[PDB]
Amino acid sequence: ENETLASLKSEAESLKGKLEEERAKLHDVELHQVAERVEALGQFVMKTRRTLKGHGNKVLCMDWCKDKRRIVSSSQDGKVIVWDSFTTNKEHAVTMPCTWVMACAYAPSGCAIACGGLDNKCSVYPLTFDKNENMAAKKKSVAMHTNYLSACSFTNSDMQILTASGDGTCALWDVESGQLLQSFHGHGADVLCLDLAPSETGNTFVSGGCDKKAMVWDMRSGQCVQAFETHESDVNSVRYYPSGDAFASGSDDATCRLYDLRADREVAIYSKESIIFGASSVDFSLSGRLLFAGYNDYTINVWDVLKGSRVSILFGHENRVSTLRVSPDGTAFCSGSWDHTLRVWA
Amino acid sequence: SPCFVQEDKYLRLAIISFQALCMLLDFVSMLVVYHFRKAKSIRASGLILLETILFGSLLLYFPVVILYFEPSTFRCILLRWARLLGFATVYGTVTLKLHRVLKVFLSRTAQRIPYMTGGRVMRMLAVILLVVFWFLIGWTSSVCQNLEKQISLIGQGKTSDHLIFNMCLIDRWDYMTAVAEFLFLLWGVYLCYAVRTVPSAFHEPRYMAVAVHNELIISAIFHTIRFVLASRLQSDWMLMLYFAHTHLTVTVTIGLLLIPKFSHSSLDPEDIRDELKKLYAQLEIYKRKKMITNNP
Amino acid sequence: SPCFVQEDKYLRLAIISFQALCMLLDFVSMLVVYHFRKAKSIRASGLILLETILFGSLLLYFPVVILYFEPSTFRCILLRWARLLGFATVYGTVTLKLHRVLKVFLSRTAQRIPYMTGGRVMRMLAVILLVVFWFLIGWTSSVCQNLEKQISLIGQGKTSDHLIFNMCLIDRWDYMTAVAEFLFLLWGVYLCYAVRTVPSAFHEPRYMAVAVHNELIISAIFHTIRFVLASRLQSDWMLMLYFAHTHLTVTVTIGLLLIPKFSHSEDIRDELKKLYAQLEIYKR
Amino acid sequence: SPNMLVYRKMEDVIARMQDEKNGIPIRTVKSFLSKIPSVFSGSDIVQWLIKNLTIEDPVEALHLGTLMAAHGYFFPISDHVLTLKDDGTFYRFQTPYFWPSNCWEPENTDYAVYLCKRTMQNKARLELADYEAESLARLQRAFARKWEFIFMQAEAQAKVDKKRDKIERKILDSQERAFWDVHRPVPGCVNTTEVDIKKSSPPTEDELQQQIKYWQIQLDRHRLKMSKVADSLLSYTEQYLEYDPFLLPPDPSNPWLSDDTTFWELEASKEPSQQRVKRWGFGMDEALKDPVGREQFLKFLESEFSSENLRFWLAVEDLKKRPIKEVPSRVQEIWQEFLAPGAPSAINLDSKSYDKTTQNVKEPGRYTFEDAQEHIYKLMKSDSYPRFIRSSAYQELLQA
């Protein structure tokens, strides 16, 4: 039996070594050393254009609208506000019976919002143009987990919402009936973020967990097709490259990395000596040329995706930066904070 | 004749009549504090300690009533008995009371409450009124022998040639009871340099600290003017300088301390004494030189 | 024609011969106390509070050695400067040192003794001495504004037959200065009736309360004699009085404050465990 | 250990500050009034950081410095608001015992002991701060019965500290006010000790066959060369440079730069612009993304009498956008109309694709015709869509 065990060990070693030698032969050039042909960029003068106030505590998450003007944000004390960014007018409000409302998303049709937090439930609020509206009567519970809700987002339609919680499971629900459709397992620790694939035809999504892994799932069946592990600590946020063939992640070791799907390996690392505070949210420009990152040292950094050199640093916040999203048209990005404020940059 | 300086009768009666009102609205307010006697503010600073400021200010309105009636002896002596005896009983008890609001807070880390209202703030006022009272007896007894020989204590001054008037002389003992009233208030400035932090309920330790900062500034001017621009001056201009000082210094004080109080709101304790030094000994060696990089 | 009485030898320089010896032995006592500085006797009182009584006592010796010479308008001002700047420092840290040994005893019925020390007693001798300069500064100016007038601060007095004497006059500010010396020691008498039973190691409250009490009967007769019996006087009966009042007053005092220092002699139980718990990690 | 990663990288910098050969020198200063021992100027650090860390921007160096100070590593000698200022102010390090990485969380029975110690020291002035005295009154109200023991410990610590040196008694007493200032901050300053609530919480042969099937999966997966992968990224990025508002301004102007709202109206209009039409031909996916593109593409096919395939294509996602309650009826309607035999809109499928959907129609679901979805998608991307580009209607709209 020991001879057979040794033979199996030798076969496993041979298969492994075959894998590394295939990776070595496929690895020939580097992204920066091949994109050096690309001309360098000039100077950027991005400045604050609006400043949204009214929250009574820390601001935890936000999401843009499909009309490129409206914004929905969430706070610690359970208050959800739907703003009008271009003119700075509050349009709706609701106080949710929990604290630490972590996740909020905005429906593509602009008729519903989603929210959740420590109550381990995700709720969907219809939107109407009534006077003295009471959305608490229309509030509908959809998802139920055994741990806090971390991040949720509607799919390409208005009937299904994804869910990520601290129990290490991601689930797909139906908003109208509350019936679960598919459950995803494979994280041994908490799940902190997720993002749908940019391609509407592509039925996949990515999720990053506390176990230092980014995990790509299949919506039809439920088992992952890829797995990455190169971070030194928690993975705080992930996002797809607009081409749909790559995704970047921002982890707590103060680095943002850009993985690849065809190459099955990372192709860049964005880090600097003067930066020692961990990232918290990333997003891409419209063309994928810039990777915005909102750090915990109160600042915002912008990186050249192709080259790897920083282009600008934007001060202004007086506490941590909790979130960062780029508007659908690609003209401006907003960034919440723990200083009770949101600022729209452009 | 026309050898005398002329005087007014309307611009002069409008001073002895406007001050006969501030001397009646200072005696009426002494029967308002007694009739009430029970409030969250009037019980803090006791009546025995507050009503001696509304009676000590009643002696600070006299130096102008005498300065109108006529000049003579007994009206030039009475003008100094009622400025030093009305200064040591007003700003001498807004300084022993700004001294109590420091030594009742350090006594809340224990249980003694040493300074009683009329026990340690009014028994320390009988010592201030004993140095100011021994001096006045000595001064009025040495200018009574000198009036026999040559000095009449009332002189004359001349302005615009043929215009004469009678004034009250300023002797060399008046330059010294203006430095004694300025050094003494420097104690009331330090005493409010150490109470800027003590938590107070009605902020009284702060409305009495601007009545002291007022006088160290606004009364060092009235004395300098009265000592330089004195020989020439006038008879109706001196009456205004006094009236412009006994309404801008003492009236602002009985208003800074009266209306804000009506409107604006065995072996067991032995061994523990040793072990508690062991904790501060073991804890001390961790920071003392253990890789502190400052001490070495 | 006798008008000025001449006399010397037997009385005049005999007084200043011995009066220059007390001031000579007063300085060596300021170099003997400092050299020892460690005996338990003078460690109890304090060195600073013992060097200001052996220094302020020199000033009380001057009123005899400036009365020896002829009167002047400058030697009649130092006579009232070295009598109040010396009485307020000798019997100003004796009444205060006798106040510290009363308010510490009152802290024996209570607890938490702070033991105010020669920094506290010397912060209270700078306020008693601040009032004295304010008066003395304000008094020489007063007798400097009438120097342009009569009352020349220097007088003349005659006797029965024909003999005149060039003496120094008595002001009405001297009747009031001799009362401030009598109402100030009435406070020190009360400070020895409330310490009458308080125990002490060297019995200083006793050899010192015989000082603030002796210099209240004998220094109240000298002042009364100097005032009432002042018209006649002489230029030799002055020295016989100042000499006979200074050595019975300021020599007895620095004898009693110097010789005796050399010649004779519930949930507590619960809280203990929490203290022990932090002490159990500390001991390991 | 939530913050331990960043605490282990500020400490590495501190060790580099303290080095004797190439670090910040420590000096004793005296300016005609008193002697201040062992301090360094505020401008010493800011000039140091720009050199060793290569922080070109001077605001960035001052922002990095003030975060180190605010966390409790070096502090202003005579202030209660920890910060870093580029002037001559004197700062001083913190002892490694009080470092925040030592897991400190003091109670309120230990703050009062420190707070009562200050009143005993210099009992003629009561030197404190406005907020400190307010806390002292509050703590005595609560800790009433046991106040004796808090005051009793304050006496012992005071007399023990009295018997020390003078230079040491000042340094070791400032580094106990830079510890309670970090842990009990002055009102109006962010509390850096707060933390997020998410982060405050057999035979050996069977293992081999799991590993064997684990390795073959990676071998099964197809990979490309980094030369080809890099080309795809750069080609895609360079293809949209003219479309990025951040790197080439819009027409007429950015609504967030010049308050010109017309930009959104033009894009949302029913008449596509010249830039819009060019983006149409980049790929068939881009055309289908635009709702106007869907109509124009369908309009050409119905004129060509070959739109039966598009009608099947759009029908599948409409089922997926439909709530589950109506899927069993929706799947049969698509079944009969398009791929059932004799359908009015009959279409052709591969045998393998038809077999899977034939056995799956019995169990309705949102993903029933996914294989047919891919099969139709591929053929449009090769033949139908390129024909639309060659169609005269495409170039006529291109030029206007």
Ligand SMILES: CC(C)CCC[C@@H](C)[C@@H]1CC[C@H]2[C@@H]3CC=C4C[C@@H](O)CC[C@]4(C)[C@H]3CC[C@@]21C
């Ligand atoms: C009135 C003028 C002429 C003489 C002043 C002497 C007396 C009468 C004055 C008037 C008011 C008196 C005080 C009134 C009240 C008290 C409280 C008592 O528990 C002790 C005595 C004490 C502190 C008195 C001390 C002496 C005092 C200050």
Ligand SMILES: CC(C)CCC[C@@H](C)[C@@H]1CC[C@H]2[C@H]3CC=C4C[C@@H](O)CC[C@]4(C)[C@H]3CC[C@@]21C
């Ligand atoms: C003319 C003479 C007698 C008086 C001159 C001394 C003046 C300036 C006064 C009188 C009382 C004095 C002392 C009392 C008060 C203090 C505060 C204490 O914390 C330190 C000593 C200090 C500072 C002393 C020095 C100077 C002082 C404030």
Ligand SMILES: CC(C)CCC[C@@H](C)[C@H]1CC[C@H]2[C@@H]3CC=C4C[C@@H](O)CC[C@]4(C)[C@H]3CC[C@]12C
């Ligand atoms: C200038 C100096 C010497 C004069 C001193 C007189 C002062 C101390 C005297 C005279 C009038 C007295 C007041 C007369 C009226 C009252 C109201 C009574 O219910 C309690 C006593 C009280 C509050 C007295 C307090 C002391 C007082 C103010």
Ligand SMILES: CC(C)CCC[C@@H](C)[C@H]1CC[C@H]2[C@@H]3CC=C4C[C@@H](O)CC[C@]4(C)[C@H]3CC[C@]12C
């Ligand atoms: C106004 C307040 C302070 C009342 C205090 C009483 C004082 C001012 C009064 C009471 C009695 C008065 C004395 C009465 C009579 C004479 C004789 C006169 O030829 C000179 C003044 C002299 C010696 C007065 C001086 C002032 C005096 C002492």
Ligand SMILES: CC(C)CCC[C@@H](C)[C@H]1CC[C@H]2[C@@H]3CC=C4C[C@@H](O)CC[C@]4(C)[C@H]3CC[C@]12C
């Ligand atoms: C104001 C001046 C001129 C008057 C002089 C009298 C004053 C200084 C004297 C006379 C009698 C003294 C009182 C006699 C007895 C006591 C009892 C006790 O409680 C201690 C102080 C106290 C209350 C004394 C305080 C001071 C006192 C009132």
Ligand SMILES: CC(C)CCC[C@@H](C)[C@H]1CC[C@H]2[C@@H]3CC=C4C[C@@H](O)CC[C@]4(C)[C@H]3CC[C@]12C
């Ligand atoms: C106890 C304190 C406050 C007051 C001191 C007592 C006063 C009232 C006494 C003590 C000394 C006295 C003076 C001593 C001698 C004379 C000379 C005589 O030809 C006229 C009266 C006169 C001028 C006395 C007036 C009253 C007097 C000033």
Ligand SMILES: CC(C)CCC[C@@H](C)[C@H]1CC[C@H]2[C@@H]3CC=C4C[C@@H](O)CC[C@]4(C)[C@H]3CC[C@]12C
């Ligand atoms: C009302 C009393 C008890 C308290 C106030 C004392 C003052 C006002 C009094 C008390 C004794 C008085 C003195 C008594 C005797 C004389 C001698 C006389 O030839 C001139 C006035 C003179 C010098 C008096 C001046 C005023 C005086 C000092």
Ligand SMILES: CC(C)CCC[C@@H](C)[C@H]1CC[C@H]2[C@@H]3CC=C4C[C@@H](O)CC[C@]4(C)[C@H]3CC[C@]12C
């Ligand atoms: C410079 C000389 C001539 C006089 C100047 C007066 C000023 C500077 C002095 C004289 C008396 C002094 C006070 C005497 C005693 C104390 C008590 C001490 O614990 C704090 C300071 C304090 C309160 C002093 C502050 C300063 C002071 C008011």
Ligand SMILES: CC(C)CCC[C@@H](C)[C@H]1CC[C@H]2[C@@H]3CC=C4C[C@@H](O)CC[C@]4(C)[C@H]3CC[C@]12C
């Ligand atoms: C701190 C303040 C209150 C101190 C007050 C003292 C001031 C005002 C005193 C001190 C010296 C004084 C001067 C001394 C001498 C003379 C000559 C005489 O013809 C009067 C004016 C004049 C020129 C005085 C004016 C007032 C004066 C300047």
Ligand SMILES: CC(C)CCC[C@@H](C)[C@H]1CC[C@H]2[C@@H]3CC=C4C[C@@H](O)CC[C@]4(C)[C@H]3CC[C@]12C
């Ligand atoms: C006759 C004129 C010139 C003098 C009168 C001044 C007095 C009566 C007035 C004038 C300015 C007034 C003060 C103005 C400001 C404040 C601060 C606020 O808390 C209201 C009360 C208070 C504290 C007032 C109290 C009364 C006051 C001191």
Ligand SMILES: CC(C)CCC[C@@H](C)[C@H]1CC[C@H]2[C@@H]3CC=C4C[C@@H](O)CC[C@]4(C)[C@H]3CC[C@]12C
């Ligand atoms: C105003 C005048 C009269 C006050 C008397 C002078 C004082 C300030 C001086 C004179 C000599 C001085 C002393 C000289 C030497 C020493 C010995 C030293 O080990 C302690 C201080 C001490 C004891 C000094 C204390 C202050 C002192 C007593």
Ligand SMILES: CC(C)CCC[C@@H](C)[C@H]1CC[C@H]2[C@@H]3CC=C4C[C@@H](O)CC[C@]4(C)[C@H]3CC[C@]12C
């Ligand atoms: C020595 C003489 C000639 C110089 C002038 C006298 C004045 C300036 C001196 C003499 C005695 C001195 C005091 C002696 C002792 C102390 C106690 C301590 O707290 C320091 C200040 C203080 C309170 C001194 C202040 C200044 C002081 C009052």
Ligand SMILES: CC(C)CCC[C@@H](C)[C@H]1CC[C@H]2[C@@H]3CC=C4C[C@@H](O)CC[C@]4(C)[C@H]3CC[C@]12C
């Ligand atoms: C600080 C305390 C002890 C008070 C002492 C004040 C001294 C330093 C000051 C205050 C007022 C001053 C006097 C004011 C006016 C005059 C009149 C002038 O013709 C000669 C100088 C003389 C006499 C000044 C001498 C110095 C003086 C006496």
Ligand SMILES: CC(C)CCC[C@@H](C)[C@H]1CC[C@H]2[C@@H]3CC=C4C[C@@H](O)CC[C@]4(C)[C@H]3CC[C@]12C
């Ligand atoms: C240094 C202190 C302790 C004592 C000295 C006191 C000083 C400040 C004062 C007291 C008496 C004052 C003198 C009194 C009067 C005159 C006459 C005048 O025509 C010129 C100034 C002159 C000569 C003064 C000069 C300053 C003076 C000497």
Ligand SMILES: CC(C)CCC[C@@H](C)[C@H]1CC[C@H]2[C@@H]3CC=C4C[C@@H](O)CC[C@]4(C)[C@H]3CC[C@]12C
């Ligand atoms: C000038 C001469 C005649 C006066 C001297 C008087 C002598 C003989 C007497 C008068 C009063 C006496 C003192 C009265 C009270 C006390 C307090 C007691 O606990 C000890 C003895 C002591 C300190 C006495 C000592 C001797 C004493 C001072």
Ligand SMILES: CC(C)CCC[C@@H](C)[C@H]1CC[C@H]2[C@@H]3CC=C4C[C@@H](O)CC[C@]4(C)[C@H]3CC[C@]12C
């Ligand atoms: C024990 C203390 C109070 C001593 C103070 C004594 C003073 C206040 C008093 C007591 C007796 C008084 C004397 C009694 C009689 C005479 C004789 C006369 O021809 C001139 C005044 C004169 C000389 C008086 C002057 C002042 C005097 C000396």
